[PDB]
Amino acid sequence: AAAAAANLNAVRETMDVLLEISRILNTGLDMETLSICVRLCEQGINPEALSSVIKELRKATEALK
Amino acid sequence: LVSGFEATINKFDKNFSAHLLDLLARLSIYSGMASVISRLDFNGFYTERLERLSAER
Amino acid sequence: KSPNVLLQNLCCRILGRSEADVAQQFQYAVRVIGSNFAPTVERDEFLVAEKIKKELIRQRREADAALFSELHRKLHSQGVLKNKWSILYLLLSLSEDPRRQPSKVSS
C-alpha cells in the first residue's frame, strides 16, 4: 500500500541506524544478517542465547571452506 | 573396621569440604573482608578449587 | 513471525551452504534457543546505553561517542521494534575492541 510503504521506509531507516552502530562496534555481520535479527527481537528473544549461536555458526563454516 | 573408620571419615570429609566451599563461595559473591580467606590458606594451597562451571544462558 | 522457520532463514545467511544439505548444525542452534527463549533479566536499555558510551569514551574516541548519542535517539524515534533493549543487548555482545581504526559513514 502507501502506509505499508511508509512502514518500509520506517524500517529501512532503522536497519541503517543499527548498521552504523554495527560498524563502530565492529561486528562481523552485514545488512542482510542484521535484517533477520530485528524480526526475532520484535517477537521477543534472548540475546544471551542468540550470541552463542552466531559465534558458533561463524566458527564452524570455515571447516566447509 | 575400615567400615567404622575410613568410610565414616570419607563421608564426613565429603560433607565438610562441601560446606567449606559453600562458606568461601558465600563471601566471594559480594566483593578487609577477604582477609579471612587470605589467612586460612596463607600458602595459597587449595586457594580456589572452584573455577565456576558455566550455565546455559 | 514464527521463530522456528525464522531461525532457519538465519542459518541461510551465516552459512553460504544449503539448509537441505546440512541440518546437524541447525540442530545445535535450536538446542540453545529453545531451551532459554526468554532472557534471564528485565528490560533496561538505559544501562546498556551508558556502557556503549563508556566503551567509546575510554578509548578517547570522544567525537564518536557524541555521534552515538544521536544514533541512540533515532531507535526510539521510529518505534517499529518492541524491545529496543535487546537489539542493543545483542550488538554489545557481538562487539570487539580493535584498539585502532576510527572512521565514519553516517549520513
List Cα–Cα distances, C6 to A43, C9, C26, C29, C70, in angstroms.
11, 5, 12, 12, 31
CA dist., res. C14 & res. C7, Å (int): 11
Question: Which residues contact residue B26 at a Cβ distance below 8 angstroms, ignoring those fewer than 6 apart?
Answer: none
DSSP sequence for chain C: --HHHHHHHHHHHH--S-TTT--HHHHHHHHHHTT--S-SS---HHHHHHHHHHHHHHTT-HHHHHHHHHHHHHHHHH---S-HHHHHHHHHHT----SS-------
Best CA proximity match to B34, nearest among B13, B53, B48:
B48
Q: Judge: C80–A52 Cβ closer than 8 Å, yes or no.
A: no
Q: Judge: B56–C32 Cβ closer than 8 Å, yes or no.
A: yes
Breaks in chain A (C–N beyond 2.5 Å) sit after: none
Size of interface B-C (CB pairs under 8 A): 8
Give partners of C (≥3 CB pairs < 8 A): A, B
> In this structure, is the dihedral angle defined by the CA atoms of residues C95, C11, C106 and C88, taken in order, positive or negative?
negative
Those of residues 7-66 in C touching chain A at CB distance below 8 A are 7, 9-11, 13-17, 22, 25, 28-29, 32-33, 36-40, 52, 55-56, 64
What's this structure's resolution in Å? Answer: 8.7
Please give the method by which this entry was determined: cryo-EM
First to last CA, chain B: 48
Q: What one-letter code names the amino acid at C104?
A: K
Query: Which grid coordinates belong to A32?
Result: 542482510
CA dist., res. C43 & res. C74, Å (int): 19
CA dist., res. C106 & res. A22, Å (int): 12
Q: Rounded to the nearest 10 degrees, what angle do helices C45-58 and C84-93 cross at? A: 40
Best CA proximity match to C67, nearest among B15, A52, A24:
A24
